[PDB]
Amino acid sequence: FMVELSPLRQDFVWGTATSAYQIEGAVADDGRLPSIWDTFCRVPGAIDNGDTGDVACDSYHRWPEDLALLKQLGVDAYRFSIAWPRVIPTGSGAVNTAGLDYYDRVVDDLLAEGIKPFVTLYHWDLPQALQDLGGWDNRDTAYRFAEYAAVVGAKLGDRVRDWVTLNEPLCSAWIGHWEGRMAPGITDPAIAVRASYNLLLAHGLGVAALRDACPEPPAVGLVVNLSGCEPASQSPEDIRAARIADGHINRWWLDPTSGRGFPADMVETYGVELPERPGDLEIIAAPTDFIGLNYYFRQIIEADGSVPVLGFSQVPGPNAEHTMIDWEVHPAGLEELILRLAKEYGAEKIYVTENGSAWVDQPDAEFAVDDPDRTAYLEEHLAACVRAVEQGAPLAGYFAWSLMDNFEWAYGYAPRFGLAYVDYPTGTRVMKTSGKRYADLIRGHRE
Numbered sequence: 001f002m003v004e005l006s007p008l009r010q011d012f013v014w015g016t017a018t019s020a021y022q023i024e025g026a027v028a029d030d031g032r033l034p035s036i037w038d039t040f041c042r043v044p045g046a047i048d049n050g051d052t053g054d055v056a057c058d059s060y061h062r063w064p065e066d067l068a069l070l071k072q073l074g075v076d077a078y079r080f081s082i083a084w085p086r087v088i089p090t091g092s093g094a095v096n097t098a099g100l101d102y103y104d105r106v107v108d109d110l111l112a113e114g115i116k117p118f119v120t121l122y123h124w125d126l127p128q129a130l131q132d133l134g135g136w137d138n139r140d141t142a143y144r145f146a147e148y149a150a151v152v153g154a155k156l157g158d159r160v161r162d163w164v165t166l167n168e169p170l171c172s173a174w175i176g177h178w179e180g181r182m183a184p185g186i187t188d189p190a191i192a193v194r195a196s197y198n199l200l201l202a203h204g205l206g207v208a209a210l211r212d213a214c215p216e217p218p219a220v221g222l223v224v225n226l227s228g229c230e231p232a233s234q235s236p237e238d239i240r241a242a243r244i245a246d247g248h249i250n251r252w253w254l255d256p257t258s259g260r261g262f263p264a265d266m267v268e269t270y271g272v273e274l275p276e277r278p279g280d281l282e283i284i285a286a287p288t289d290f291i292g293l294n295y296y297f298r299q300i301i302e303a304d305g306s307v308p309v310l311g312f313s314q315v316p317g318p319n320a321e322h323t324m325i326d327w328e329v330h331p332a333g334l335e336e337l338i339l340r341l342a343k344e345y346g347a348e349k350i351y352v353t354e355n356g357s358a359w360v361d362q363p364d365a366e367f368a369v370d371d372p373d374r375t376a377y378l379e380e381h382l383a384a385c386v387r388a389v390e391q392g393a394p395l396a397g398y399f400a401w402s403l404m405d406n407f408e409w410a411y412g413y414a415p416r417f418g419l420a421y422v423d424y425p426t427g428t429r430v431m432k433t434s435g436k437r438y439a440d441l442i443r444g445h446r447e
Contacts, residue, residue: 003379005445007386013116013397014442016070016419017079017354019123019167021053022406024083026060031096033089035125036135037409040183051412057404058427060102065429067109069403069420072431073439077116079353079399080106081123081167084148091127091144095151103152107159118353118399119156120164120223121149121206124172124183124409131184136172136195139275142202149209157214164292164353165206168225169199169253181410189309193272200256204283223292223353224253226337232302232315241303241312244269248310249299258345259285270309290396291341292353295381298333321373323357325415329377331384338388338395349396355381356401358408358415367430369421374434382441400438404429 021037041052059066070078084091086099107117122145130141149165157163166172175182177192186192203222210218229245231238247266255263261281262274297317304313317328334355341347357377361369378400389395405418413424419435422428431439 001376001379001383003383003386003441005382005386005441007390008445010446012395012445013077013351014075014445015077015079015118015397015399016073016075016403016438017118017399017401018059018066018403018406019081019120020083020086021056021123021125022402022408023057023059023066023404024086025053025055025058027054029060030086030098030102031089032083032086032099034128035083035085036128036131036183037125039128039131040185043185046185047410048412048414051407053407055424056407057422057424057429062427063102063106063109065427066403067113069429069431069435070110070115071113073403073419073435074442075115077118077162077397077399078110078403079118079120079164081120081125082152083125084122084145085125085127085129087152088144088148089127089129091130091141092147100151100155104155107156111159116162117156117160118162118164119152119160120167121145121152122165122202123167124176126183135184136177136198137191139198139201142198142205145202146205146209149206150213153210153213153218154215157210157218158216160214161216161219163210163214163218163220164223165203165210165220166199167223168294169196169203169222170225170249173199174248189270190272193270194275196252197274197276200253200284201280203257204286207286207288208283219289221288221290221292221351222253222257223294224250225294225296225354226250227295228298228333228336228340229301230298232300235303237303238301242301244310245299245301245312245314254341254345256281256284257286257288290349290351291345291347292351293334293337293341294354294401295334295337295352296355296357297327298330323373323377323415324359325411327357329357329380331377331380334381335384335388338385338393339391342388342393347394349394351396352385352398354399354401356417358417361416361421361432363421363423363430367421367423367428369430369432371432371434374419374432375437378434378438379441
């Protein structure tokens with residue numbers, strides 16, 4: 001199968017994405033202080049194989065090697081994140097000049113190569129100093145986030161025009177504070193629900209901070225990892241359970257940012273008093289210029305009385321094709337979610353801010369990798385994007401996760417998502433077949 005991209009407008013944005021803790025390393029260099037992910041990597045058992053982000057791809061010191069990959073791809077845009085503890089290391093007060101200078105240089109270099117920066121402010125690396133004050137269960141953290149947004153926007157917002165406040169708040173809130181599988185490893189539904197609230201408040205305060213501080217008017221959006229939630233059977237119980245999952249995974253984030261309040265069925269499900277103050281709903285519903293869809297899989301849901309509060313469990317998806325971390329391959333789910341954002345939520349501009357897959361790579365001695373399953377996943381999901389556009393969706397671009405292999409959180413380095421292979425001992429990056437195919441597809445679209 002070879003995807004046909006001609007239905008996409010010529011001003012479609014072709015991109016690829018990374019995040020700071022996953023690639024930068026240099027965790028103690030040039031004024032950086034620890035994040036909650038530094039701390040989590042010191043907890044025995046938290047990360048598969050005892051991996052850490054201490055070195056990762058060493059992109060703090062090897063940024064030109066990333067830029068070389070970006071030029072080889074011919075992407076129009078690069079989505080990367082700013083490390084809060086590199087810029088305001090304690091989360092309050094003093095700005096770390098050297099840290100902010102790094103990102104200033106990245107922006108200039110990208111623009112010199114004709115590549116637009118898409119900047120994520122928060123990609124999970126909360127300063128540990130703020131976690132020591134209660135983290136996202138302290139409303140003050142949202143105001144610290146807004147201050148950080150204003151610092152970064154004032155510095156970069158003459159050149160950076162495209163901004164993400166938070167990446168995947170579901171992961172920060174539910175996986176970081178309910179499941180405990182991501183930093184800070186808390187397992188408490190009440191803390192988790194309050195954290196989800198303060199995260200959404202931080203999003204809204206951050207939108208306002210960027211519009212106030214950027215020298216040129218910013219386009220700002222939230223990034224959410226959505227999954228269609230489908231019942232394992234047509235029993236009334238499974239249908240209802242899948243709808244609760246839909247609230248937990250999708251509507252909890254989309255409804256209040258769209259001005260529809262928090263979904264009443266989920267408020268009743270959680271039974272947690274939201275830490276709400278007058279005016280907060282208007283802040284959370286701050287007007288945005290796009291919505292960022294991260295998509296990897298749908299979720300098949302069954303009713304499950306053994307799961308406290310939620311009463312549902314994910315079960316395996318039925319498609320034969322699964323990635324190395326057992327994520328079902330289902331490109332139709334990407335088409336469907338793009339259309340749901342356009343139709344049900346009236347989204348005026350949608351980006352696929354992440355999509356990609358991890359497979360076992362077999363490099364040769366010079367790190368060349370032929371990755372046919374990663375390539376096929378890419379082509380099939382691009383075809384789903386094309387179908388959504390043909391049905392009227394305002395899809396403005398697509399960002400491949402990821403530019404190169406990197407630290408995949410509690411999985412460690414085992415799942416390689418890169419379009420380019422990374423030899424971690426040397427930092428050598430070598431484009432895989434998938435990345436070369438992506439470059440060919442971009443070129444063919446522009447021709």
